[PDB]
Design an enzyme around this catalytic site. Sequence first.
Site, short mmCIF file in Angstrom:
data_model
loop_
_atom_site.label_atom_id
_atom_site.label_comp_id
_atom_site.label_asym_id
_atom_site.label_seq_id
_atom_site.Cartn_x
_atom_site.Cartn_y
_atom_site.Cartn_z
N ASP A 64 0.88 -1.14 0.00
CA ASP A 64 0.00 0.00 0.00
C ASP A 64 0.92 1.20 0.00
OD1 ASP A 64 -1.76 2.17 0.68
OD2 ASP A 64 -2.87 0.89 1.98
N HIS A 65 1.01 1.86 -1.14
CA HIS A 65 1.95 2.94 -1.27
C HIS A 65 1.62 4.18 -0.45
CE1 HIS A 65 5.24 5.14 -2.91
NE2 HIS A 65 4.89 5.09 -4.17
N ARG A 66 0.42 4.27 0.13
CA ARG A 66 0.07 5.37 1.03
C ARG A 66 0.80 5.29 2.36
NH1 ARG A 66 -6.20 4.46 1.22
NH2 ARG A 66 -5.26 2.50 2.00
#
Lengths: 243, 243, 243
Positions: free
Chosen positions: B215-217
């Site tokens: 999850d690149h967030r």
Amino acid sequence: IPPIPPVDFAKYGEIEEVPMTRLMQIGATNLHRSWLNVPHVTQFESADITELEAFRVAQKAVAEKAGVKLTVLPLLLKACAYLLKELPDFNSSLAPSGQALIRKKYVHIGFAVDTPDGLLVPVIRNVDQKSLLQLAAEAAELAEKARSKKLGADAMQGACFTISSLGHIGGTAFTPIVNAPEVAILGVSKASMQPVWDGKAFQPRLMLPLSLSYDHRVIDGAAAARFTKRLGDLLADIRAILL
Amino acid sequence: IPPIPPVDFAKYGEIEEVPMTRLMQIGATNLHRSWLNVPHVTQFESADITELEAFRVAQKAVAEKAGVKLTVLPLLLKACAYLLKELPDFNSSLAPSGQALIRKKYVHIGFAVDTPDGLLVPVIRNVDQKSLLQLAAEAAELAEKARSKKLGADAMQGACFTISSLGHIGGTAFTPIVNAPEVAILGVSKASMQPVWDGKAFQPRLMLPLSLSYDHRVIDGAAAARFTKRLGDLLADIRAILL
Amino acid sequence: IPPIPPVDFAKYGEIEEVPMTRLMQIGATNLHRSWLNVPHVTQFESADITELEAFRVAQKAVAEKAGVKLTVLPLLLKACAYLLKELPDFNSSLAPSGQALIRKKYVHIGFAVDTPDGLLVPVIRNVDQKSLLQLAAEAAELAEKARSKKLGADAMQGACFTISSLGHIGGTAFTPIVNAPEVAILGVSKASMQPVWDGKAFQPRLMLPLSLSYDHRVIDGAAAARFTKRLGDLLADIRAILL
């Protein structure tokens, strides 16, 4: 979905506006629709086509006498029609009710052609019934009509699966986007000589990279790994299709 | 999100409708939820498991006396529990307020089992506290109950991370989907003998392909590259876990 | 878009909440915006940098006398500015009307810097006009200011393309997310010695993995394969930039 904020691009330098063909716009819309609808996974594999290639090149004579060019694409199409019959979940679509799959009992396959005006995916009907030179002929025809805008919308419908071959330009692999309502697409990239362990030393084999993206709602990981494996097996020995 | 236009599939040939199990439908829904919520990146790496494999195979005796089969999965689970403690951002979840991370101080890990009815991800609790034969035992049990529908919903909850191993079927790599609310998933594919430069010549080493989607967030690129690197390091020498 | 259901994480063990910096939150928001707006494809390629590396290392003297460090990044930046001028669809953005592309006649390129507080992408203006030591100098400065929070928002605007280099940590490849409104981003991973067939035997060449993700609405598959190929060609011999 949140919009992208507009930017005055000209604050940073000279800009020029060129417009999008209606084909680009259509394409854009459809890709975004698939992207938001399909949870995408790509499964990568390499197939040993050393012997396929030798066969291809040896039939150059016969192909020329028939007026066709025998490329890897008819070979790819034949092997995928066979697999699409073996593993039917790949030859199906999610029914609008979200609770059923519609298995298609026919195998029609599209292949991507990049034209000046945008992307077209002509469809070859009943791939499972045609021979390698029939398919080589037809692929070419549909490709020429596509580049020449003479491709009638009819020929762009009712495909079950798509092959996108970039092997002629280059690259190691890519992650193609599923053309919904289909449930999978095979990307093919450039073939390279690779060292492959024979149990005792590394043998140079001509390896073709395959990238299968799929609709993970319909296809699970193991099914997709099994599909690219079988395909690697079929391309390593196309005679298994005779069985 | 724009819907996919309905197509009368039968215009093109014979179709048949098969239905989706409630398990498939649940799965479909959850994958699409993750897909739309999680900006996904996959980081690929290869780990040298030549020596892990030798160890695995040598303990076949001991494993058999204990009634377990020692596969690469307990080894994978142990090494990831250790890393999940070292790099805690991977053992956390985005809090509903979007402004906080909830770091979990426990390590429970799920692993994907593909059953007839759909995908189940049984969860092993406190992986960090169990030994390689405990984990080999438990993994198998949960797997048999999963195939036999005897897996109670309890055992499918509160995982921190997921491993999806397709190494037994084939493939080079794939891009798994994060099971939100978790923030990462490790895909493992088939191990191959590969030539690896020793500074002077190419040595055959058994390489295991790892695909970590995240999850690149919550996880940035450098953190993820650092995670698969450490994992490649831990699998190349599992004794570093003892340190 | 369906929300992820909240989970009481503490049922499973001890949890701790740490908060997100405003930088993380901004980053999170922007990535999700891109993710939902851009149908993403990643094209993978490997470039032969054996000779680039030799050059790099030989100019260590000159670089030191000028006070810069010559890394692969100025070399990457120079070659991409040249390509961004050759293949202008990569140096453009989708106009808000969805029916036009705005081609930028300037080349400014951002590069990702991972700082404590989150990700920053400083932008170097007019990369096409600067020399390898100018770019090496400037890249470093912008990087130090970024880590030191002394980077003013101005320097984070109006980029045309982004390079994300993780080569210094490790990894084989990854699938970066496009920073919309840009239409492409180049991910670069760790370079390895690889056997490359010279037509007769396998020669060890230093290969750099490139992962180009692109906005498939604007860039089609063949254009992207052509871009990473040209880039592989330019890095194999940087003198072609002189032509």
